[PDB]
């Protein structure tokens, strides 16, 4: 049922509970990781799109 | 995976060129779309966790 939390709702009641303004800060600290990996294979599958249409 | 915009125009000097200008440009609007699916198995539960999980189960009783 709705009436149950999600895990997420749980950790967010964790997280304010544990860090209420240093949750911001891990935040930033794994988007600068996950961004230059997601970045680097968004340009690696445009360059291949871009190949293929050549192909084409 | 951050999302794919169309194809903007065919061709490669001008529409390719402004299509790099746009998906990779300072400003930009990168949307996320999930990768498909990988089959995951399921994880093979402790039994100090099935110590905690049935220590529950007793206490309806």
Redesign the interface.
Same mark, same amino acid.
């Given at each position: 049922l709705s009436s149950i939390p999600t895990a997420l709702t749980r950790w967010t009641e964790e997280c304010k509970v544990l860090d209420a303004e240093s949750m911001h800060d891990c935040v930033s600290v794994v988007k600068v990781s996950i961004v230059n990996h997601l970045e680097f294979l968004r340009d690696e599958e445009l360059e291949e799109r871009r190949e293929k249409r050549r192909k084409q | 995976? =951050?999302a794919?915009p169309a194809?903007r125009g065919?061709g490669?000097a001008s529409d390719?060129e402004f299509e790099?200008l746009r =998906?990779?440009g300072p400003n930009a609007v990168?949307l996320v779309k999930t990768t498909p699916l990988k089959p995951s198995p399921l994880p093979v539960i402790p039994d100090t966790i099935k110590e905690v999980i049935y220590d529950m189960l007793n206490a309806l009783a």
């Amino acid at each position: 049922l709705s009436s149950i939390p999600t895990a997420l709702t749980r950790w967010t009641e964790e997280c304010k509970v544990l860090d209420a303004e240093s949750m911001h800060d891990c935040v930033s600290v794994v988007k600068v990781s996950i961004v230059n990996h997601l970045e680097f294979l968004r340009d690696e599958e445009l360059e291949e799109r871009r190949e293929k249409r050549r192909k084409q | 995976r =951050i999302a794919l915009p169309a194809p903007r125009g065919s061709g490669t000097a001008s529409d390719d060129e402004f299509e790099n200008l746009r =998906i990779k440009g300072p400003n930009a609007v990168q949307l996320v779309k999930t990768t498909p699916l990988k089959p995951s198995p399921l994880p093979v539960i402790p039994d100090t966790i099935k110590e905690v999980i049935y220590d529950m189960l007793n206490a309806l009783a």
